[PDB]
Each structure stands twice: as C-alpha cells, then as structure tokens.
Structure 1
C-alpha cells in the first residue's frame, strides 16, 4: 500500500533529512516479493543493500549526516580522490536510479501509456522506465538479463491487484492512490538527482 507511506514534502531549502528518507524508501523493496516470481528477489536485495549502506554510514553520526547533502559534502572531504565512488555517496548514486526506475514505471502506468495491441501487459512501461533510469549504466549482459526478467513481469491487472493487496478497489481508485504517492516521491528523487549534478558526484560507468 504505497500511499500509506507517503514521502515528506520538500522543505523550502530543499534539504532532505536522511533518517526520514531512508525510513520511507525502505517500504519499497519488499513490493518486489509480490510481483509473482522469484526473479525479483535479487532485486529486492540490491536496492535494500543500497539503503542498508546509507543507514550504516548515517548511524555512525546522525548529526553529521542529518541530510543527504550532508552525506555528499562530508564524504567528499573524508575520501578525497576516491569520492564519489565510495561510501554512502556511491550507495545513494545507485539508489536514486532504482528509485527513478520505479518512479518512471509507476508514472507511465498512471498516464495510461500501454501497448494498444497487448493492453494488460506492463512491458512497455518497464522498458521505458529501464531506458530512462538504468540502461545507460548497464553493459550488454545485464541488459540481456533485464530482457529475460521482463518476461516474469505480471499482467497489469495482477500488478494493480497486488498494490492494493486485495482491497476490493477499482483499478481507477488504485491508480489515483499511486498518483498521490508519486507527488512527493518524484519531487524528492528530482532533488537527489539535482544534488548529484551540483556536487559533480554523478559517475557514468557501466556494469
């Protein structure tokens, strides 16, 4: 149930408190265990791992790492020339990309983007999310692994069904709750991308 854990709104100064953020996004990886296939469990674990790494660094000193901007600027100072490919900065660099993937996927579904010829699939939505969020950073083996995983994707009706877990709500109602979640989720992700740009903390290497 996405809109039961809305993200906070951005404050005027656009600084994101680390503790609240981590707590919010930590409700996202489990969803990957209700998409119908064990092919997604490794994906839960990849995104959780990013979250766990940021929390581990935050837990060393919450006041020093109070906001996400604090994390980047502090680690830049701590690590010198190995930064930004170290620590929580690297974990959040990759986290923002998974989060962005989810954002683009959910927004595509809610904007009614679909394959007219195969309308209860979610493949076009996942393929667009992947091209926007992830593909730039994956070598061809991983891109092939994505293309294989796409076939385990559930039908759209089943996917919406699992997002409400059985609430007996119309798809229309379901999509409206998703639109609501997307408000502060997109705004937050955009601010994390903008901070990576302003700090020159973004790297373009492929895996």
Structure 2
C-alpha cells in the first residue's frame, strides 16, 4: 500500500519510488513476453527518477522539488528532460494501471464475453495513453491485445478467493488514485505536461 496524501499534498520522492518499484511486475501477470517492453519502459522511468534523486536526496525530497529544480537546471529544454520527463511518462503508465484495475473492480465488461479484458484495457488505454501515441504504436497496442490473458487468469496471477482479490484491489486503488491525481495536477499547474506523440 502507498502511504496516504499528507495535508499539503506533497509526495516524498524516496518513498514514492519504493512503492512504485513494486508495480512493473503487474505486466508479468498478463502472462506473455509481448508485455515485457512495457514493464521495461516503466522500470526505466523509475530507475531514472531514482538516479536523479540519489544525486541529492535533500534537494529532490519531493516530486515537486524534482520539477522546480530541473526547470532551473535545464531552462529551455525543460520539461522534456531528466526526471521531469521520466515522471511525465511514468504517471501515464500508472494511470493505465489505475483505470484498468478500477474498471475491472467496477464490473465493466462485454456481457457477451465477460471473461476477456479487452473493454477494460481499451478503456485504460484510451484514458491514459492513446493521445500520446501515433497510429503505428496504436496498431501495435491492438496487436498486443490478442496476447491478453483471460480476466480470471489475470486475477489469479495478481495473487485467497477472487471476490476478495477484487476487494484487495479496491483497497489498493484509494491512495494510488489519490497520488496519481496529485501528480497529474502538479504537471498541469507547472505547465510541465507535453503532448508530443510517439
């Protein structure tokens, strides 16, 4: 469990990194090597933010410290630089995981094919990543969906019943959603969000 947001809504870097380093394996529960590059991309971001943090933990104590310090340090290159860029991408993946799991927990599905995960992953993708992907990467997303597991199999890998698995997940989603929201609002407030497409 991620720690809850303090009153001031600031996120301490070290403990954020520690918690989110546990999430790349989420993609291993999908059950196919097709999803390895996704895990590697999210891990990459985390590694890079950690590297910046470790150069000076006091100065980069919060995620906000990271953005404001880097903004001065890189001037006209910022925000397409350093840990600011890595976190800009990381939050999108983290949002995918949030929308995806929330959707599953809320019982969104295709009534004709309730044990697929297509409508949920497609929803998450739409809300988290689609806007930042060119048409070629979107066609790759579509191919990758044919590697998706059965919902029941994914929930089994995420592990002690299935009805509770969903409840553990709902409990996880509280502070996770709240933290991700704060990070997005931070990017918006600092005009650190970019829109280029891969």
Q: CA deviation at 1:171?
A: 1.4
1:97 lines up with 2:92 in the alignment: yes
Of the candidates 13, 26, 30, which is equivalent to residue 8 of structure 2?
Answer: 13
1:109-138 deviation line (CA, Å, top 9, x unaligned): 000000001000011000000000000000
Q: Give, in angstroms, the shift of residue 30 of structure 1.
A: 1.7
Taking the aligned partners of 1:156 and 1:32, their CA distance within structure 2 comes to 13
Q: Which moved more, 1:153-162 or 1:31-40?
A: 31-40
Distance in structure 2 (CA, Å) of the matches to 1:35 and 1:132: 20
Shift of 1:100: 0.2
Q: Which moved more, 1:25-34 or 1:91-100?
A: 25-34
Which ranges of structure 1 fall in alignment gaps of 5 or more residues? 1-5
5+ long unaligned stretches in structure 2 = none
Deviation at 1:204, TM superposition (A): 0.5
Q: CA deviation at 1:79?
A: 0.6
Please report the TM-score for the alignment, with normalisation by the length of structure 2: 0.99
Distance in 2 (alpha carbons) for counterparts of 1:203 and 1:135: 14
Give 1:44 shift: 0.8
SS at match of 1:80: helix
Structure 1 stretches of 4+ moved >4 Å? none
Displacement, 1:35? 1.9
In structure 2, C-alpha distance between the alignment counterparts of 1:15 and 1:109, rounded to whole Å: 29
Q: CA RMSD in A?
A: 0.6
Give TM-score, length-normalised by structure 1. Answer: 0.95
